[PDB]
C-alpha cells in the first residue's frame, strides 16, 4: 500500500539553487552541505502519513564498493528529527500521492556520483535516481568556503578566463574558455579522480587537488608532443585529448596550458581555482638561489640552454583550508 511510482529530483530548481545550473537542467548536480528538494510519487494514495513515514528509509551510495566506514554509504530515515548537518530527509510538503522531501548532505561528504535508494520495511531496495555531489564554496562549514559572492562567481562560475602571456613589461592577455561546466568535463574529472583508490579521502579538498594535479602533470608529460599547431579552443579539448587520446594535441610551445586544465578540473569539481602567471621564473634549480647563464663573445647563447633557466613566464592556485597544517595557512 506504499508503492513508488516515480521520483522527481527537480534538477533545474536544485541546480539553480546549488549554482550548478550551467552544468545541466536534466541531471542533478548538488553541492555538499546544502539541502536539495526531491518529489516522491506513490502509485496509490497514502492513507496514514505517520506509519508510512516510519516505514521508509533512504540510502545514499557512492563508489563501486560503498561502506559506512569509508563514509561512502549512509542510511537515514525521513523525519524532522534527523541531523540536518549530516545526511537527513524531511517532508516539507505532502499530498495524498506525493511527498516533497528536502534532503541534506554533510559538509564533509565524499564527492562523486551518488545513487539515491529508498527502502521500505519488508520490501526490496529501490533506486530513485542518480546525482553528483560537489564541493560547496557557498557553505560556511565547507573547506572550500569563500567569503565573497563575487569571488565565488569569478573563481568557480566564470567559464570565460584570461591567461596572461608575454613578458613582464608587455603583458598580453589571452582569452581562454575554461569550460568547467561543459557536459562531459565533470564525468572526465571524476573518472580521472577514480584512478586514486583512497576514496575515503575524496571528501578532503587537499587530497583531491593533489591527486588531480599529479595525474594532470602525468598526462601533460605523456601527451604533449615536441614541436595550426598553436590554435587553442580552451581547456576542454585539451582535457579530452589528454584523457581519451582523440583530438588535436598540444605541443611543447604551449605547455603552460596545464595550469588552465587544472583550474578547469578544480572549478568543475567545486574547488575555487585561478590561473597565475609569474614572469621571469627560475625553473629547474631544485631550490638553489643561483642561475648560471652562458653567452659567447657575440652576446649569444650557443647551446639550447642549461637545466636551470629563467623562463619568460610560467601555475594553478586553489582556495581551501589546511587542517593538517599549522593554523594560519588557509586561503590560496
Amino acid at each position: 500500500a506504499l508503492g513508488i511510482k516515480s521520483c522527481d529530483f527537480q534538477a533545474a530548481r536544485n541546480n539553480e539553487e546549488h549554482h550548478t545550473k550551467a552544468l545541466s537542467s536534466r541531471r542533478l548536480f548538488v553541492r555538499r552541505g546544502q539541502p536539495f528538494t526531491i518529489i516522491l510519487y506513490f502509485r496509490a494514495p497514502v492513507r496514514a502519513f505517520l506509519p508510512a513515514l516510519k516505514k521508509v528509509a533512504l540510502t545514499a551510495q557512492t563508489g563501486e564498493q560503498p561502506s559506512k566506514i569509508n563514509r561512502t554509504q549512509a542510511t537515514f530515515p525521513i523525519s524532522s528529527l534527523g541531523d540536518r548537518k549530516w545526511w537527513s530527509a524531511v517532508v516539507e510538503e505532502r499530498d495524498a500521492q506525493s511527498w516533497t522531501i528536502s534532503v541534506t548532505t554533510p559538509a564533509d561528504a565524499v564527492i562523486g556520483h551518488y545513487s539515491l535508494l529508498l527502502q521500505v520495511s519488508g520490501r526490496k531496495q529501490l533506486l530513485l535516481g542518480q546525482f553528483t555531489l560537489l564541493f560547496n564554496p557557498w557553505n560556511r562549514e565547507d573547506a572550500v568556503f569563500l567569503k565573497n559572492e563575487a569571488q565565488r562567481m569569478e573563481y568557480l562560475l566564470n567559464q570565460n578566463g584570461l591567461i596572461y602571456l608575454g613578458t613582464a613589461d608587455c603583458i598580453q592577455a589571452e582569452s581562454w574558455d575554461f569550460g568547467q561546466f561543459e557536459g562531459d568535463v565533470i564525468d572526465l574529472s571524476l573518472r580521472l579522480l577514480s584512478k586514486d583508490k583512497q576514496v575515503e579521502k575524496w571528501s578532503q579538498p587537499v587530497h583531491v587537488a593533489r591527486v588531480l594535479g599529479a595525474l594532470l602533470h602525468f598526462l601533460k608529460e605523456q601527451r604533449v608532443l615536441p614541436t595550426l599547431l598553436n590554435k587553442r579552443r580552451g581547456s576542454v579539448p585539451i582535457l579530452r585529448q589528454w584523457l581519451t587520446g582523440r583530438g588535436r594535441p598540444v605541443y611543447d610551445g604551449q605547455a603552460w596550458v596545464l595550469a588552465a586544465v587544472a583550474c578547469t578540473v578544480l572549478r568543475c569539481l567545486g574547488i575555487p581555482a585561478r590561473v597565475v602567471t609569474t614572469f621571469a621564473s627560475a625553473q629547474g634549480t631544485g631550490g638553489r638561489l643561483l642561475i648560471d647563464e652562458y653567452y659567447n663573445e657575440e652576446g649569444l647563447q650557443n647551446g639550447e640552454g642549461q637545466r636551470g633557466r629563467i623562463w619568460i613566464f610560467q601555475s594553478t592556485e586553489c582556495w581551501m583550508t589546511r587542517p593538517a597544517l599549522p593554523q594560519g595557512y588557509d586561503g590560496w
Partner: protein, 145 residues
C-alpha cells in the same frame, strides 16, 4: 493534393511513451521567397521541453524543412519521410552518436539501402505480396548488421 494517410485512416497513446524518452519535432513549411528547399537538423546538448510540443516529453532532435513550391516536392510527405527516418532505431542511434553531417549522410544511405520499393501492379494478390516477407527480413538483417 489531399493526403493519402488522412483520406484512409482519418475518415473513421501518451501512455505507451516510455518515461525516460525524448521527443523529436519536425517542422515543415512553404515559403515562396526561397531559392531552394533547405533542411535544418538540430541535436540539443541537453533535452529540453519547448512550448512547441504540448506534451511533457523533452525535445532532443529538431527537423526544419522550408522551401518554395516545386514539382515532385510535397513538404507533408517530406516531413513524414523525415519522421519515419528519425523513428527508425538505427538512424536514431547514429544521430545520437553523430559528430558531423557525414555520419548522418552515411546513416541515411544505409537507410535507403534497406528500403524496399513496391511497384504498382495490375492484379494485387496477397500471396504475391506475402512473397515479400523474407526479402523484408533480409533487408532488416542488413540494416541491423
Amino acid at each position: 493534393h489531399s493526403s493519402l494517410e488522412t483520406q484512409l485512416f482519418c475518415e473513421q497513446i501518451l501512455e505507451k511513451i516510455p518515461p525516460d524518452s525524448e521527443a523529436t519535432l519536425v517542422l515543415v513549411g512553404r515559403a515562396d521567397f526561397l531559392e531552394q528547399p533547405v533542411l535544418g537538423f538540430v541535436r540539443l546538448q541537453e533535452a529540453a521541453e519547448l512550448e512547441a510540443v504540448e506534451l511533457p516529453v523533452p525535445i532532443r532532435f529538431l527537423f526544419v524543412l522550408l522551401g518554395p513550391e516545386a514539382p515532385h516536392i510535397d513538404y507533408t510527405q517530406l516531413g513524414r519521410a523525415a519522421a519515419t527516418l528519425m523513428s527508425e532505431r538505427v538512424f536514431r542511434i547514429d544521430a545520437y552518436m553523430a559528430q558531423s553531417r557525414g555520419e548522418l549522410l552515411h546513416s541515411l544511405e544505409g537507410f535507403l539501402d534497406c528500403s524496399l520499393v513496391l511497384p504498382p501492379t495490375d492484379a494485387p494478390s496477397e500471396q504475391a505480396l506475402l512473397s515479400l516477407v523474407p526479402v523484408q527480413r533480409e533487408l532488416l538483417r542488413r540494416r541491423y548488421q
